[PDB]
From Swiss-Prot, chains A, B, C, D, E, F, G, H, I, J:
Gene3D superfamilies tied to this protein: Tobacco mosaic virus-like, coat protein (1.20.120.70)
Localization per record: Virion
InterPro entries: TMV-like_coat, TMV-like_coat_sf
Name of the protein in question: Capsid protein
UniProt GO cellular component terms: helical viral capsid
Keywords per UniProt: Acetylation, Capsid protein, Helical capsid protein, Virion
Main localisation: virion
SUPFAM superfamilies: TMV-like viral coat proteins
Task performed by this protein: Capsid protein self-assembles to form rod-shaped virions about 18 nm in diameter with a central canal enclosing the viral genomic RNA.
GO MF: structural molecule activity
Species per Swiss-Prot/TrEMBL record: Ribgrass mosaic virus (strain Hr)
């Protein structure tokens, strides 16, 4: 069966998989909304997490009856953490009592901070789209390989 | 029969199921009302709970004669807790004796709090509608799978 | 007879139908009134609900002797929830004992809130009118199709 | 006889007809009054409704012995809903106990709201007059056509 | 029947289809309105989403009795995400209590932000019109091809 | 009968037709009014929409007993979207409580914005007039052609 | 009788006629008043509209017992739309509560806007006078011609 | 009848005709005014356009009962586009708020630009006068010829 | 039928055709306007695009019943891209808040930029006129040739 | 079948192909717009990327039923990266708070930077046009060769 030991072959186990369908659809769910909210962007990242699960264990090899998405590869990982990060936060401070601080934006501490955050998530959501989908990132038993052991309960 | 043991295959048992009909109809019941009330929004969340039951046990597999809704998936779970949460509460304080505090809204503690809560539940009730229904979230014996055991009282 | 199973073909069953006559007439009943009331706008949405019923079941197909209105399509669904929602509420607070709070509107918590709500329901009631009626939204056995099964009690 | 089925030919049935005489006369009844009232403007719109009936059914075609007014055409529909809407409401708030709020208009919530509403209904009542009457809107068996079926009980 | 496995042939499945009629009509619904609103632009993008469904599955090939629109092609995808994005948001901040911040626009945080957003959605709505329609983007069994497998339940 | 399939012959179906009479008359209705209003310009565009219907279906060819106006041609389409767009909006902000912001136009956010919008709709309303009418845009069975199929229920 | 079909012969039907008497007299009614008003200039344009009717139909040719004025010719059309347009509007803003904004014209948004509008309508009202009357614009069965058909119910 | 095919004989069809009377009179209407305006010069060019129509079709030859003016010949075309162009525009910039920029013409961006434009339209309006009228430009069935076909419905 | 394969014979397919009538008329529509605008020049180029379609496919040869205009030839292509490009843009920067930057043109960044752009589009619009029309650019089955194959479904 | 190993024969696999139709049409979409924008130029490059895919794999040779465009050849590659690069960016800095920096262009950091960028993309868009199309760049099984192996699953 599959019997892994060498640690160098463990950079593709947990928090590095999904499927073309699940991932791409999640991204559209995000992009199609306003960036003046927390519910949306915050929950969005939390959506992607639910799919950032695992698949290849140390005993049952990757099946031919499947093709998952290595969420920590070429363009996905760097631009997906960079992307999901774009909506990190912002200098949110609603200085009020009931009425927003009267002369709040006279000599304030933010404006283009919120505006510029939006640009981040926005356009990166797109470049991701094309890269993500194509081949930059994808993998299956075909591309999942190196020098892997197989020796537990027989089945070949 | 079905005979489950591996815990990794238990993230889809209790408080994660329903059916297209029950769920979608509940959402309309909510959306079609005012957000200046507690009866409505509070009881609403309590409505969704009655449907957040369980279906797949450890012995009788998912039937072909059915298609339920995994209430803890892709878009539903993150935006449904975020949604149901939108009507968490608000800074409700009816400072009165019989007559609401005379000069209550002069230098008060709330206004857009109540207003902004409404926006939350409202628009998220919609984005949910389309996502929820489509395929983002749904499942049945067809999509309910991984590596599951079946060995109790024979019937195949 | 009709014998449906595939869930992907269930996004057009409950809370998604009506008829050109019923729907359009309901909209006029709404639009022709004042927006400084609750009886009207609130009951209005509740009117549309009574027509948001169902028609196509899993066994008796859509008849040639009919043409219903898919209330969850193109322009209707997004602008009808957005519309019906326009009269969500407002920051209604009649701070009084018998006499409205003397200096209530000196440094208050609302005005253009009520005013701006009216604009919402109002003009959207119209854009709806033209869109709704035309073809954006309508359907019948002619447009109600995909890949649907028919196999119960014979009648062809 | 007339035997209609195609839905595309149903955008001219209910709530879209009247006659040159009834409609124009109703408009004068409105225009000739003060806009500081509710009885007038409110009941006015309700007057136009009584005439917003139906005429062409699915079996007895439009007669040669008549010429009705399609209340949902060219200029009428857009400017008639816009018109009838002008007297939607206003920020009406008579803050009093018996005596209107003493210092009510010091730092208040309205003035040109009421004033500006009047301008709306007023001048639009006129532009309507000329447009409405001419040809922009009118119709009869001559202009009521497309590709309509006639096949029930014989009479030709 | 159709029996797909190669992942490289999965960049045209979900969230990449529609039809000439549905798509173009949705765009007009958008363009014909004011850009000083949220109901409109926000719900607009949500309209396009309802049509961003799927069509070609892994078993029933693209029919000759149809011609859909690949919403992720040549000009559509880049300028449609860029377009739908134009109405991302803006620096919306209605600093008020009832009365908009007195000296709000003296030394404020926005103006041409809202104005410039409008230009974005506006003109891009047009360039899209011509490109979208022509051939830049469209596809059917004629143009939907590469090296695709067909081997399940026989029917040829 | 008419039996169309080739998609390249679908850029002249929905939202691309009208008649010389309806269209030109609508334009005059617009031009003859003030540009310091929303009722007028907004409803205007909504007027043109009611005429932006369809005529040539896939089975009943264009008649000799008619001459419609292709609203998406030569000069009409580019300058009609550009025109109808001129009255997109403006930086409308009536900062007031009852009394317009005292020192509102000292160091404000708009003036020639409103003024310059008017110039847009205005003069383009004219250049349109001559172009629109002449031949730039018009069509009928005479000019509506390419390589179109005709094969359903016989009638020649 | 008259039996027109060719569309090229339809640029002189609706909204393009009147008579020397009606038109010239209307212009004097306008010119003889102040340009610091809305009643006058606004209603003026609306006056000219009432005369911008139609005369030559597709069956009863232009009579010898008449001479009308083609309101869309040589100098009339370009300078009449340009003229009627001169009184488009202006940057009208009466910033007041009861008392016009104290320091309103210190650093304001308009002055020569109103002044310069007056010059527009004024002098163009004159150049029109001479041009309009002479021959630049006028027509009758004598000048109304091209290649027109006559074939319905006989009368020659 | 006339039956043209050779394209070399199509440089005298659309946008190349008028009549001695219409054209010359239009030019005087222009020349007799101030060049410190937009209404005049702009509408002027738009006047000439209304006459820049067509006359010789591919089937009804040029009549003996007429003499039109080829607006794209010898001196007219080059000096008429050059002329009509003279009033292209200018560096118009009224830098003001209500009061023209105080020290606007100290170190400004224009003066002789406006002045020199006037000279252009002015004197070219004259040289045109003599050239235009004489013979440089004029034509009729006498001068309209080359090697043209005539073969449709007989009439000779 | 026509059966093309050799790629060298593909430099005259898409985005390289039109007709003498459509093209020349579009150019006049452009030239007759001011160059201090964006609506005009921008939409102009977008007008020419609508005509930059295709005609000669790989199976139905160029007809004798037609003569189109190869928009990518001799003088058209180089001077038409150069022309359409003349109105690329300019250093447009309206530095203002409501009042254009007081001392904006003292030590500014542009003037003859806008002025010089106008000269570009202007005069090139003319040289184009003569070249375009004559023979420099035109083509039909007569001039559309090289060594082209014809072998699909028989018809000769 | 095709069985490649030698790496020297891998400089024509990924990110080096397309087709005459797709590529040339994309270029026109770009060129026909203003260069004072980011949406356009930025998304443009992202458009070309979607077509910069791959075609020749290591097992299924280049077909006779096709002719693609090697996007990394003679003139395309050097001038296409140079071209697409022209719209790299610019010294974009909108120093403002709501009102662009008053004395921003007195002693600033840019002007001809933006202007000169436009020239880059512009004219190179053209030289590309002719080169790209002709033969400089194109290829197919005819020109795609060197010394390539073919030895997997038999089919000759």
């Amino acid at each position: 069966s599959y019997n892994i030991t060498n640690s160098n072959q463990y950079q593709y186990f947990a928090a590095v998989w999904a499927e073309p369908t699940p991932m791409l659809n999640q991204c559209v769910s995000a992009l199609s909304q306003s960036y003046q909210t927390q519910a949306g962007r915050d929950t969005v990242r939390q959506q992607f997490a639910n799919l950032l699960s695992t698949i290849v264990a140390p005993n049952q090899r990757f099946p031919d009856t499947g093709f998952r998405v290595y969420v920590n590869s070429a363009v996905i990982k760097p631009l997906y953490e960079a992307l999901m990060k774009s909506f990190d936060t912002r200098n949110r401070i609603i200085e009020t009592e009931e009425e927003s601080r009267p002369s709040a934006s006279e000599v304030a501490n933010a404006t283009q901070r919120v505006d510029d955050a939006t640009v981040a998530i926005r356009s990166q959501i797109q470049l991701l789209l094309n890269e993500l989908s194509n081949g930059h990132g994808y993998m299956n038993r075909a591309e999942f390989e190196a020098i892997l052991p197989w020796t537990t309960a027989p089945a070949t």
